[PDB]
């Protein structure tokens, strides 16, 4: 069973160098024509091909990122490294490393190209965030006018933030939205809840463990 | 460079149906196409390699076809786990181009969004910033457009959006849009509107408030 696993810093600053490692098992980088490629995916976007290295130290890079990318391999340690120099907030993404098959070889010489035409096995992926930003807690504001109400969990770094209602009691009609990275490099999130326009107290229990900021914001019309 | 285009881009379907996604290249890529299925928070899984070859482990329901410039993936009988995003990869030319994706959601009856606008709290304004929030509650299909206007002036570049994932029970989506202004600018205007356009709405619904009616 082939398995790959990405490792490296979850947080890098701009102009710095990002070094990612892909550790594997189930194959060797000395097997004929095998390749280990890197593909990234910006939060809620498409896959983007980055680079690939083969058993024969043959390497290729995305033409856009050519200048910054460097791919290496240590056939003995079963690892492949990807070095991205001078990163910017646009390079914030989940980076995957994947295995590419060699051709069907009979007697060590290829007889079929077929099997190479796909990246057959991928790793779980590693989320890498780029920010000049320092760790800090969210400010919770109410969103008071079925009826709708909520909490605006603003200006925090880094992710994540857990939001529960009435200490877990209220879950029906709740919509905790994905956070948005603002221009300031800080995150913002909003949690809402739809309720009968009859009623009974509503409190958003906000927790941002990185800054150790726990807040209980009561909301009303 | 290359350009490898996926169509639909998005599609609605129910358990059992049959669907066909299309990946199209600008140049001929021979048989060098791959198909992936991506479940949220998980890496892409290989379905079809070499345009038509089924990957060992992948269910029979899947099928690949085409050669050169025209490629298709054909799921015959849609299953639960098959509700995901699908990508196609070209491995003939460097760089190994990917398709923009083709999201597959659960189909249900059209649901018009229940729209709510929220003004910025008086305890936020005290800190110099004003976030006006608009909520487009439990709707279907996913496509919606929010337009922010402040005294009939179109706000552009000062708002951010977010969409929930298709609800497990409702089979709906909910969106929150946040218009961000400065306290100083917020207080220079009166009417704040959230104009919502959607298919379940015969015409663009507008939710507003006057910072000047008290």
């Amino acid at each position: 069973r082939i398995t790959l696993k990405e490792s490296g810093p979850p947080l890098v600053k701009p102009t710095q160098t990002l070094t990612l490692t892909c550790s594997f098992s189930g194959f060797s980088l000395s097997d004929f024509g095998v390749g280990v490629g890197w593909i990234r995916q910006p939060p809620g976007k498409a896959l983007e091909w980055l680079a690939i290295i083969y058993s024969d130290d043959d390497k290729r890079y995305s033409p856009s990122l050519n200048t910054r990318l460097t791919i290496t391999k240590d056939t003995s340690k079963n690892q492949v490294v990807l070095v991205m120099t001078r990163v910017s907030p646009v390079d914030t993404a989940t980076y995957f490393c994947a295995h590419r098959r060699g051709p069907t070889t009979l007697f060590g010489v290829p007889i079929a190209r077929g099997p190479v035409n796909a990246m057959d096995v991928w790793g779980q992926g590693i989320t890498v965030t780029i920010s000049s930003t320092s760790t800090k807690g969210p400010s919770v504001f109410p969103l008071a006018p079925t009826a709708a109400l909520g909490c605006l969990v603003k200006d925090y770094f880094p992710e994540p933030v857990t939001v529960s209602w009435n200490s877990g009691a209220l879950t029906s009609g709740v919509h905790t939205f994905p956070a948005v990275l603002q221009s300031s490099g800080l995150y913002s999130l909003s949690s809402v809840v739809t309720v009968p326009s009859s009623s009974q107290t509503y409190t958003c229990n906000v927790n941002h463990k990185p800054s150790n900021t726990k807040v209980d914001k009561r909301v009303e019309p | 460079a290359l350009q490898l285009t996926q169509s639909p881009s998005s599609l609605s379907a129910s358990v059992g149906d049959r669907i066909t996604i299309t990946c199209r290249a600008s140049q001929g890529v021979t048989s060098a196409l791959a198909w992936y299925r991506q479940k949220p928070g998980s890496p892409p899984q290989l379905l079809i390699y070499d345009a038509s070859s089924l990957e060992s482990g992948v269910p029979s329901r899947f099928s690949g076809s085409g050669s050169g410039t025209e490629f298709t993936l054909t799921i015959s009988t849609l299953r639960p786990e098959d509700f995901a995003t699908y990508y196609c990869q070209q491995l003939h030319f460097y760089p190994h181009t990917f398709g923009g994706g083709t999201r597959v959601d659960v189909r249900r009856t059209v649901a018009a969004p229940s729209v709510f606008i929220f003004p910025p709290s008086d305890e936020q304004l005290k800190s110099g910033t004003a976030s006006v929030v608009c909520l487009l509650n439990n709707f279907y299909p996913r496509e919606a457009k929010v337009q922010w206007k402040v005294d009939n002036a179109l706000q552009s570049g000062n708002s951010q959006e977010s969409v929930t994932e298709q609800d497990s029970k409702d089979s709906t989506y909910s969106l929150s849009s946040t218009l961000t202004l400065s306290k100083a600018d917020y207080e220079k205007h009166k009417v704040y509107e959230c104009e919502v356009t959607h298919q379940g709405l015969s015409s663009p619904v507008t939710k507003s408030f006057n910072r000047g009616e008290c």
Partner: peptide, 10 residues
């Protein structure tokens, strides 16, 4: 554009 390592094998 340049081509895949294996763009040329049968």
């Amino acid at each position: 554009l340049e081509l895949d390592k294996w763009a040329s094998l049968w």
